[PDB]
Amino acid sequence: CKSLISENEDTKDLLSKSPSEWQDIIHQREQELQIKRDVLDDLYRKLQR
Amino acid sequence: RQINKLIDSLPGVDVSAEEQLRKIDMLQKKLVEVEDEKIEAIKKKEKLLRHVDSLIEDFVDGIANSKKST
Amino acid sequence: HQSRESLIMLLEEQLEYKRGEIREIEQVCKQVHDKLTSIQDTLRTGS
């Protein structure tokens, strides 16, 4: 059990619990998506002339 | 026979030079209007290219301040 | 009556040259505008 733990990286990185880093991933995901949508809307509005 | 087929083929060989002269004059006229039209064409092409430069700059600024927001 | 008519053959050669230059200029900027519209549609589909 200690050997399998020691030799595998994934099973040590994901040691069960979620700190707030998942919520920070969700914040960078949502902020970068909506700004892309806004700039694409601006481009769509401007280019149609 | 090449002599015959070349002397009858001078362009306007059977056309009086004075209508040659009105057609030339109106050619320079319509030329004046065609470079004029090209001057509006190029000015509005530059206007759309400047609009394209402005939206490029705005989009680049949006990318820059978004990827440095976090 | 031929020497002055040289200016005429010159007339059509520069006229056709400038027409070719003009036509390839609206062609290239129309195909750029078409590319821009296609890109706009592509980014709208990805939204």
Q: Report CA-CA distances (Å) from A10 to A13, A24, C18.
A: 5, 21, 68
Nearest to B28 by CA among C2, C8, C4: C8
Of the candidates C47, B61, B57, B66, the residue with the CA atom closest to the CA atom of residue A32: B66
Which residue in C8, C9, C40 has the most chain B C-beta atoms within 10 A of its own C-beta, making it the best mutation to test that interface?
C8
Instruction: Using an 8 Å CB-CB cutoff, list chain C residues near B12.
Output: 5
Contact A41, C40 (CB under 8 A): no
Burial of B50 (0-12, 13-18, 19+ CB in 10 A): exposed
| CA-to-CA separations, B20 to B10, B11, B34, in angstroms, rounded | 13, 11, 20
CB contacts of B31 in chain C (<8 Å) are 15
Residues with Cβ within 8 Å of C47's Cβ and at least 6 positions away in sequence, in order, are A37, A40
Q: Give the resolution in Å.
A: 3.3
Write b or e for each residue in B15-30: b if 16 or more Cβ atoms lie within 10 A of its Cβ, otherwise e: eeeeeeeeebeeeeee
